[PDB]
Amino acid sequence: HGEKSQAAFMRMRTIHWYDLSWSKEKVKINETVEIKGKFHVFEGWPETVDEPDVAFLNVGMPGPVFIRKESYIGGQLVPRSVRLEIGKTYDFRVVLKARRPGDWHVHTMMNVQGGGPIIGPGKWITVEGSMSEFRNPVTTLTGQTVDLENYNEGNTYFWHAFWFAIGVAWIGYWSRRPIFIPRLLMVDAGRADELVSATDRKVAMGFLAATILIVVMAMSSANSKYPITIPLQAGTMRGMKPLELPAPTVSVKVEDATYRVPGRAMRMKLTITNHGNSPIRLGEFYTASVRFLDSDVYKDTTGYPEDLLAEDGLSVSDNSPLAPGETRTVDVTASDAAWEVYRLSDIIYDPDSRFAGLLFFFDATGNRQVVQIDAPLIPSFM
Amino acid sequence: HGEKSQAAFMRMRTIHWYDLSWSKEKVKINETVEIKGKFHVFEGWPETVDEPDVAFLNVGMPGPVFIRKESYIGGQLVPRSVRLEIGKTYDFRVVLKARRPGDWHVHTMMNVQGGGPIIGPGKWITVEGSMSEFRNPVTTLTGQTVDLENYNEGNTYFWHAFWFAIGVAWIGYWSRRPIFIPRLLMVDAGRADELVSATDRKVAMGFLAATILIVVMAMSSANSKYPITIPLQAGTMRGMKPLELPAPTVSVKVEDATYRVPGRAMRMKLTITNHGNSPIRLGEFYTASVRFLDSDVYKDTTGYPEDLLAEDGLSVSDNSPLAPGETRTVDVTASDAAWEVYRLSDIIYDPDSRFAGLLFFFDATGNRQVVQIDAPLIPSFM
Amino acid sequence: LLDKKWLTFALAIYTVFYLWVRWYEGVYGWSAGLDSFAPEFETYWMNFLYTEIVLEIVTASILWGYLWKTRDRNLAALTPREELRRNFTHLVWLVAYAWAIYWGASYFTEQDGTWHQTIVRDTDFTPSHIIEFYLSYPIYIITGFAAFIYAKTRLPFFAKGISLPYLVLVVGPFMILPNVGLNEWGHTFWFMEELFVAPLHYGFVIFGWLALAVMGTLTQTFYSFAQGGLGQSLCE
Numbered sequence A, B: 001h002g003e004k005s006q007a008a009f010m011r012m013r014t015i016h017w018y019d020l021s022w023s024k025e026k027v028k029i030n031e032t033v034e035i036k037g038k039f040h041v042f043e044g045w046p047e048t049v050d051e052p053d054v055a056f057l058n059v060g061m062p063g064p065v066f067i068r069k070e071s072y073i074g075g076q077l078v079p080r081s082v083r084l085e086i087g088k089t090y091d092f093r094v095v096l097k098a099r100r101p102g103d104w105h106v107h108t109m110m111n112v113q114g115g116g117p118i119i120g121p122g123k124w125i126t127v128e129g130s131m132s133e134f135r136n137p138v139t140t141l142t143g144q145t146v147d148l149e150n151y152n153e154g155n156t157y158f159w160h161a162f163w164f165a166i167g168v169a170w171i172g173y174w175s176r177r178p179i180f181i182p183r184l185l186m187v188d189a190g191r192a193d194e195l196v197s198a199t200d201r202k203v204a205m206g207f208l209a210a211t212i213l214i215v216v217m218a219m220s221s222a223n224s225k226y227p228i229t230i231p232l233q234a235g236t237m238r239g240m241k242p243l244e245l246p247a248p249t250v251s252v253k254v255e256d257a258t259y260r261v262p263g264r265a266m267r268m269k270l271t272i273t274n275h276g277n278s279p280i281r282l283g284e285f286y287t288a289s290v291r292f293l294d295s296d297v298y299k300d301t302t303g304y305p306e307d308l309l310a311e312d313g314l315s316v317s318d319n320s321p322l323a324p325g326e327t328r329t330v331d332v333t334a335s336d337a338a339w340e341v342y343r344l345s346d347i348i349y350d351p352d353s354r355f356a357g358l359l360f361f362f363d364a365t366g367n368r369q370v371v372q373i374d375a376p377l378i379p380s381f382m
Numbered sequence C: 001l002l003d004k005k006w007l008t009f010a011l012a013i014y015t016v017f018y019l020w021v022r023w024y025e026g027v028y029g030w031s032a033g034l035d036s037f038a039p040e041f042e043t044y045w046m047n048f049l050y051t052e053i054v055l056e057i058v059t060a061s062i063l064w065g066y067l068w069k070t071r072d073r074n075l076a077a078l079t080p081r082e083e084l085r086r087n088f089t090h091l092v093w094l095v096a097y098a099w100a101i102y103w104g105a106s107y108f109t110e111q112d113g114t115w116h117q118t119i120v121r122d123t124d125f126t127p128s129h130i131i132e133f134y135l136s137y138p139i140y141i142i143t144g145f146a147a148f149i150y151a152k153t154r155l156p157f158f159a160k161g162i163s164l165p166y167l168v169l170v171v172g173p174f175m176i177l178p179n180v181g182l183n184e185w186g187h188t189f190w191f192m193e194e195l196f197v198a199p200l201h202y203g204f205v206i207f208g209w210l211a212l213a214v215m216g217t218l219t220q221t222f223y224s225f226a227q228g229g230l231g232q233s234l235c236e
C-alpha cells in the first residue's frame, strides 16, 4: 500500500517483477499461500538509490496478518539480507502462513540498504477463520517443540513484573513518609541530616545487595536451564544464484517516447528488429507493476491483480507478425486508468523524466522473449 | 590551462585521449565547432582518485567563450553526470557554438566526483565577430521561442529592485528620525518606551501585511503565467555504451623504463611480440596529451596541437618491420621539449613514480593497433 | 571645524585604487594571467605580488609606528572640543576600515568565486589570489590596526585598557589571512571540487563572524563621543 507515493521514475527503474504467481486467493487460518516469480534488477539503477549490495526480500502487508514461513532467492532460503547484482534476473519464492482473518493486500517487496523499499505488485488475499486457531510450532536442536505465539511469554511477564514491583517497593518505602514540601524545607533550613537516618541506610544496603544477588542467581539459574544458547544469527548472504536467461533475439530501439498531460496514456515509437527464425508479435508492455496487454497476442491466465492489468491497454500501430530478419518502426500506446490510479502520470513532478520497462514478444508457437527498454519520457501539453 | 600543475603520474594514468579531431580552427560568432575523439579509462586508476562512477564530460575554456550546445558519450547526449567503467574506451563528441571573440585554448576535460578534473589536450581556436551578434534561441514545450541570453532578465531585475526598494523604504522610514546616540541614551537612561510609539506599530503592521500579501499574490500570478513547470532535471546516467575494440595482436612488456634528471627525454626497453599475420612498426607513443611520433612510420594529419606533438620525438633502436610470430627487444626514447614544457619531468616530485601510455603500431596496409603500457619510471641522475 | 575632509580622501583612495586594480585584472586576467607557468605571468602578476607584499609591509610599519610614537602622553589635559575632534577622526578611521573590509571580504572574495567556475587552478598564486589574499586582506588589516592604534593613543575612553570588542573586530578579520593556509590545504589534499560551501572554507566564516564585534566597538565609540560632548541637546 506504500506505492503510488514513491517517485514514478524510480518505480519504473529499480526492479521489474514479472512471471508473478499466487498459489491461492482465499486461505484458512494456518494454511499456506506461496508467492513466486522473477525480478530483474534494472541496469540503469538510479544514483540516489544505493546499489542492492545489501537487500532484503520482504513482504508488504499490514503487520503480521501472515507469517513468513520461508523465502527463497534462486532456490535457497534467505532469512538474512542478500547481495544482488545490477542487471541480473532472479527467481524468488515466498511461503506465507495465514494468521489473521480479513482481506489483505499482499505485496512482494525488496528493501535496499541505502535506498528504501521497492514494492512489487499487490494482490488481495482473503483469510478466513479465527486468530485463536493460529499455531507456529518450531522444534529446537535441544529436542523441544514450542509454539512461537506464546513461548517465553510467561517468563517475560514474570521477570518484568518482579523488577517493577522491586522498584515500586523502593519508592513506596520512601513514600510512606511526607515527600516534597517538608523535606524541601528541612534541606533548605539548615542542614537536613535527619531525613536520611538508620535504618534507612540499612534498607538501602539490603536493596542493593538483594538486587545484585538476585541478578546473579537468576543469571545462573537461566544458565542451568537452557544450557545451550547461540547468539543472534546475522550477516549478508553473498552468492545469490541468478537466472541464466537466453540472449533475446529481439532488439528494440525507443526512438522518442512521450505522454500527454493530462492523460491516461503513454506513447512511444519503437524500431523492432527480429533476429532468430520465427515471426514475433508484441504482446505486453510492463512499466511499473502495470501490465499493458495486446489481447490479440497474449492473454493473462495467472490471475494478475485486475487494477494493475490492462487486458487491451497496449495498442500497436502495426502488430502484424514480424518476419525474421525484418526491422520496422511502430507507434505503441500504453493506455489504462491504472496510469492515473497508480500515479504513473506523476512523473512530471519528478526531477528525472526517464522511464524503463519490459516488452514481451510472442511467436506463433507461443514461446516468449523479454526485452528491456528505457528512454527519456517527454510530456506533451499542447 | 589547468594542467602542467597536476601530478605528472596522475596525468599519465587517469584517462588517455586519442583520435582527437577539431572540426574548425577559426569560427565566426554563432558558428559551430565540433570536437570528437576517444578516451580510454586507465585500468591502473590511482587510489587517491575515486573511480569514475560519477563523471561529467566538461569543456576547458576561460568561461563561456563558447556555449556547449551538445555533448555525447558513445552516441547519446549526456547533459548530466555519467558512470564510466575502469578499463573501457568511449568515443565522445562535443558541439560548441562561438560566443566571445578572441583566441581561446579549448580543452576536453572529464570531471570525476571524487578526484577532480582530468584535462585533455587543448587546442587554440580563434573566434571572430562581436558578442552582440550571439544568439541562443530555444523552443519550449509550451510553444514559445526565447533567447537564453536575455530571457527572464527584466523580470529578475524588477523583482530584485522591488524588494530592495521595500527594504530601503523600511530603513529610511526609521532613519528620518535621529538614529544612534540619542536613541542609545534614551534606552540607557531609564525606560525608553518613547522611541517606538504609534503610528510606528501601525507602519510595521502595514509592512508585514503588505509583504505577506505581495508574496502570495506574486506567487499566484507567477502560477497563472507559466502554468506548466518542471523541477530541475538531475541524476547520473548509467549505461554508457563503450567501444567494442578488437583485441590487440601486439603484446608489449616494458622491461625497465627510466628518464634523466635533468632532461627532456624518457627511455624505455620494450619486448614487442607480434601476433596476427602482418608486419608491424611502432609509430607513436602517447603518455599524457603528448604524442611522440616516429616520422618514418606515421605522420599526423588531424591538426594536433603543435606544442603537444613531437613529429620525430620517438626513436626506436630497431624499428624495422616486425614479422608475425616474431618477438624482439628494442630501446625506445621519447624526447621532446614538451616533456619539460608540460612538466612531465615533474614526476620526480610525485609520491608514485609510475607512468602509463599508449603505443600505436602500424602495418604496411596502414591499419593500426593500440596497446597500453604501464611500468615504474626510474629517474637517473648519473 | 570638527569633522574635516579627511573622510572624502578616506573613501576616495580605496575607491580609486581598487577601481584601478579591477581594471588591471580585467586587462591582464586573460592574456598574461591564465597560464601560471608562462613568463608573461611572472612579469604581470608575480611581480605584482612581490611589490604589493613589500609595499604592504613598509606601509604597515610606517603607519603603525608613526601612530605609536605620536601617541598622546598628556591625555588628562585634553579639552572636550579637542576630544570631539579626535572622536570624529577615529570615526573617519572606522569608516575607512569599513570600506576596506567591504572591498576585501565581499568584492574581491566573491570575485575569486567567479574565477573558480571558469579556470582550473594552477597554483596558490592565481591573479585573483594576488588581489584578494595578498592585497585587499592586508590593506584592511592595516586599516583596522591603524584605527585601533589611533583610538588607543588619542581617545581617553579607549586608553587605560585594550577594548575587547575592538580587539576582536581588528584581529578576527585578520585571522582570515592565516586562514589561507586552510584554503590551499583544503583544496589540494581535501575536496578537489570547486565547491564554495565546503567545510574547507568555514575558516573564513568563523573569523568572518568576529567582525560582528563592530557593534560593541561602535557602542564604545558612541560612549566616547558622549563623554563631555554628549550635549547638551541629547537627553534634553
Ligand SMILES: CCCCCCCCCCCC(=O)OC[C@H](COP(=O)(O)OCC[N+](C)(C)C)OC(=O)CCCCCCCCCCC
Pocket: C013, C016, C017, C018, C020, C021, C024, C043, C044, C047, C048, C049, C050, C051, C052, C053, C055, C056, C059, C060, C135, C138, C139, C142
Ligand atoms: C596597504 C599597502 C598596500 C601596498 C600594495 C599596493 C599595490 C599597488 C599595485 C602593485 C603594482 C605591481 O606590483 O605591478 C606593477 C605593474 C606591472 O605591470 P607592467 O608589466 O608594468 O605593465 C603595465 C601595467 N599598467 C598598464 C597598469 C601600467 O606596472 C606598474 O608599474 C603600474 C603600477 C601602478 C600602481 C599605482 C596606481 C594605483 C591606483 C591609483 C590610486 C592609489
Ligand SMILES: CCCCCCCCCCCC(=O)OC[C@H](COP(=O)(O)OCC[N+](C)(C)C)OC(=O)CCCCCCCCCCC
Pocket: C036, C037, C046, C049, C050, C053, C054, C123, C124, C125, C126, C177, C178, C179, C180, C181, C184
Ligand atoms: C620578502 C617579501 C617578498 C616575498 C613574499 C612571499 C611571496 C610568495 C613566495 C613564493 C615562493 C615559492 O617558492 O613559491 C611557492 C611554492 C611553490 O613554488 P612553484 O611550484 O615553483 O610555484 C609556481 C607557480 N607560481 C609562479 C604562481 C608561484 O610553494 C607554495 O606554493 C607555498 C604556498 C603557501 C600557501 C599558504 C600561505 C599562507 C600565508 C599566511 C599569511 C598570514
Ligand SMILES: CCCCCCCCCC(=O)OC[C@H](COP(=O)(O)OCC[N+](C)(C)C)OC(=O)CCCCCCCCC
Pocket: C006, C007, C009, C010, C059, C063, C067, C070, C086, C089, C092, C093, C096, C139, C142, C143, C154
Ligand atoms: C597611502 C597611505 C596613506 C595613508 C595616510 C595616513 C594618514 C596619517 C594617519 C593619521 O595619523 O591621521 C590622518 C587623518 C587625520 O588624523 P590626524 O589628526 O592627522 O591624526 C593624528 C591625530 N592628532 C592630530 C590629534 C594627533 O586620519 C585619517 O582619517 C586618515 C585615513 C586614511 C585612510 C587609511 C589609509 C590606509 C591605507 C593602507
Ligand SMILES: CCCCCCCCCC(=O)OC[C@H](COP(=O)(O)OCC[N+](C)(C)C)OC(=O)CCCCCCCCC
Pocket: C060, C061, C064, C065, C068, C149, C152, C162, C167, C171
Ligand atoms: C600581528 C597580530 C597582532 C597580535 C595582537 C597583539 C596586540 C593587541 C594589543 C595591542 O595592540 O597592544 C599593544 C600596543 C598598545 O599599547 P600597550 O599594549 O599598552 O603597550 C604599549 C607598548 N608597546 C607598544 C611596546 C606594546 O599597540 C602598539 O603599540 C602597536 C604599535 C607599535 C608597533 C609598531 C611596530 C610594528 C611594525 C611591524
Ligand SMILES: CCCCCC(=O)OC[C@H](COP(=O)(O)OCC[N+](C)(C)C)OC(=O)CCCCC
Pocket: C019, C022, C023, C024, C026, C027
Ligand atoms: C561599490 C563597488 C563598485 C564596483 C564597480 C566596479 O567594479 O567597476 C568596474 C566596472 C568595469 O566595467 P566598465 O565600467 O565597463 O569598465 C571596464 C574597465 N575594466 C575592465 C578595467 C574594469 O565598472 C566600472 O568601472 C564602473 C565604475 C563604477 C564606479 C563606482
Ligand SMILES: CCCCCC(=O)OC[C@H](COP(=O)(O)OCC[N+](C)(C)C)OC(=O)CCCCC
Pocket: B113, B114, B115, C190, C191, C192, C193, C199
Ligand atoms: C559543520 C559541518 C561540517 C560537515 C563536514 C562535511 O560536510 O564533510 C564532508 C566530507 C565528506 O567528503 P565528500 O563530501 O564526499 O568529499 C568529496 C570530495 N573529496 C573526496 C575529494 C574530498 O566529510 C569529511 O571528509 C569529514 C569532514 C569533517 C568536518 C570537521
Ligand SMILES: CCCCCCCCCC
Pocket: A212, A216
Ligand atoms: C562486585 C560484585 C561482582 C559479582 C561477580 C559475580 C561473578 C559470578 C560468576 C558466575
Ligand SMILES: CCCCCCCCCC
Pocket: B212, B216
Ligand atoms: C498566515 C499566512 C498564511 C498564508 C497562506 C496562503 C495560502 C494560499 C494558497 C495558494
Ligand SMILES: CCCCCCCCCC
Pocket: none
Ligand atoms: C562522510 C561523512 C561525513 C560526516 C561529517 C559529519 C560532520 C558533523 C560535524 C559536527
Ligand SMILES: [Cu+2]
Pocket: A001, A002, A105, A106, A107, A122
Ligand atoms: Cu497494497
Ligand SMILES: [Cu+2]
Pocket: A015, A016, A040, A041, A042, A043, A372
Ligand atoms: Cu528490469
Ligand SMILES: [Cu+2]
Pocket: B001, B002, B105, B106, B107, B122
Ligand atoms: Cu589551455
Ligand SMILES: [Cu+2]
Pocket: B015, B016, B040, B041, B042, B043, B372
Ligand atoms: Cu588508457
Ligand SMILES: [Cu+2]
Pocket: C112, C116, C126, C128, C129
Ligand atoms: Cu581562489
